[PDB]
Amino acid sequence: SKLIHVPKEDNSKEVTLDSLLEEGVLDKEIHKAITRMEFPGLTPVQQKTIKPILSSEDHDVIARAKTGTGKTFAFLIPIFQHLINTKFDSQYMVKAVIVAPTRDLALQIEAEVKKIHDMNYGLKKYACVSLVGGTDFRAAMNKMNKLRPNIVIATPGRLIDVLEKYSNKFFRFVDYKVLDEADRLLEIGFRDDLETISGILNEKNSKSADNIKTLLFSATLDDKVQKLANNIMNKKECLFLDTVDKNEPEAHERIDQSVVISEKFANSIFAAVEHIKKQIKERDSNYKAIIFAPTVKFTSFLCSILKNEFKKDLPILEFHGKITQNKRTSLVKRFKKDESGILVCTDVGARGMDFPNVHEVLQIGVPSELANYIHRIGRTARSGKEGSSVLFICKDELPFVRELEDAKNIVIAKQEKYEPSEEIKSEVLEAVTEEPEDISDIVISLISSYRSCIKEYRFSERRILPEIASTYGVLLNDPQLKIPVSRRFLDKLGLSRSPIGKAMFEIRD
RNA sequence: UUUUUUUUUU
Ligand SMILES: Nc1ncnc2c1ncn2[C@@H]1O[C@H](COP(=O)(O)OP(=O)(O)O)[C@@H](O)[C@H]1O
Ligand code: ALF
Ligand SMILES: [Mg+2]
């Protein structure tokens, strides 16, 4: 299919809510809802996408725009307009399906639809239901039946669950599907799900297999995503609407990025603690920050340390995929409203989540994928606000920083070294209540996460894996102590003949 | 001794 590039333009005419109303693109009812939100104007991605999405041209749309620049309303506004344009046709049926890679993001998008409803009660007739895992299936279906929604927001697993059973009842008249965080949804482990979803919707569509228009949105995408999305794009033309220059870095330029380089992975823990201590003092506890970590077990560990250090000064919130969904949703609601606090999380929170007025993003170690560096730091400096980010890594993780330069043109100007005092080490370690077995579990989770990104980040296996493993000895305050394991466990890892394995583990069988 | 997410509360 024919890809049509519409690159970034400097001196193009400003599109406004009024201009779109006057032009007949937007109806008064959606104009009213968005005007009442009192935004200074429409963001660049909103100006670029609203009219093309609503065009009668037989095309799909790909849109790229930086983190926090209003991509959500860029698709929600034209979706609502479509519902108004076709309001007397198939009025009890789902016309738009929006898919997101995390449950909390799907639920946030639903909350944004409700904000549109609250600014104009006349839009409540275009109802919305979320279909996400970790919620009661029957309760959600009762809501589908009661509200007969025109908009569904979903995560892939639960959507497939519902579609296998109820595609005929609600989904035979879909006109749009949206992949939010599109590049994430087309990686391995989501791509097959999106192809399943797309196939069902196309097969069940009452008009034709190519009726559905597909919209892809992300801060991180290019021409390669069209290839990955080939099996789910129906139309003969695809419009690529880009608000970022070809060679311009995808990271938001307003973020003051820095990197703090330690000799050892574990030292990044002490560096982050001292950094947070300094920010709390200098800002007089007026501090809202998000700190990312590589694994669930390490995130939980890091939370314990930060509570011991800082619970007297700020709330510390624990956010990852093993937190119950009820608690995930409640903590997201709280951290959205709170003026201060520290959110400690995995990449479950890297993309999409909009927590207003976060001052700083912190990272201990590397993200789960290169693109998530851009999204992680993009949790700050949203909707025209300022922000800073600090990457805490060890020397053996430096090839990640080089890959950011080579692959994404991201060059972090501020770089500094860190070495922990014996005082901070004692302070942090003495409060740790985890047993050795728990510490082993935590460090092993890190070994596995780092092993999976060696190729992508061009790490030296022989250096990074022993360094990560040595965290066990650092945390137990004995640097020659290796991780005690069995022979069969070493065999499962495939390291029973490796010198790398001998450096990491002691066969205490 | 589940590396980040992602149905199985259908
Ligand atoms: N036109 C606008 N002007 C200012 N802020 C906006 C505008 N549109 C949306 N926002 C706000 O910007 C924030 C980030 O939007 P979001 O859609 O989450 O960003 P993205 O999806 O591009 O990362 C939200 O709080 C949203 O309400
Ligand atoms: F691009 Al986003 F939250 F969707 F930063
Ligand atoms: Mg978004």
Side-chain angles (χ1 to χ4, degrees), chain A residues 39 41-43 46 66-73 352 354 382-383:
Chain A
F39 296 131
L42 294 176
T43 66
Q46 292 163 3
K66 300 204 176 195
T67 54
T69 66
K71 289 184 290 298
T72 308
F73 289 135
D354 180 56
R382 301 176 76 73
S383 60

Side-chain angles (χ1 to χ4, degrees), chain A residues 114-131:
Chain A
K114 295 193 186 174
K115 284 174 180 169
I116 292 168
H117 287 164
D118 294 325
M119 294 302 87
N120 184 357
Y121 294 167
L123 296 177
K124 284 163 159 287
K125 65 165 67 180
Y126 311 115
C128 178
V129 168
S130 53
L131 303 175

Side-chain angles (χ1 to χ4, degrees), chain A residues 177-189:
Chain A
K177 70 178 188 284
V178 180
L179 285 66
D180 198 15
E181 307 296 345
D183 61 311
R184 182 69 187 88
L185 292 177
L186 297 166
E187 293 172 21
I188 295 295

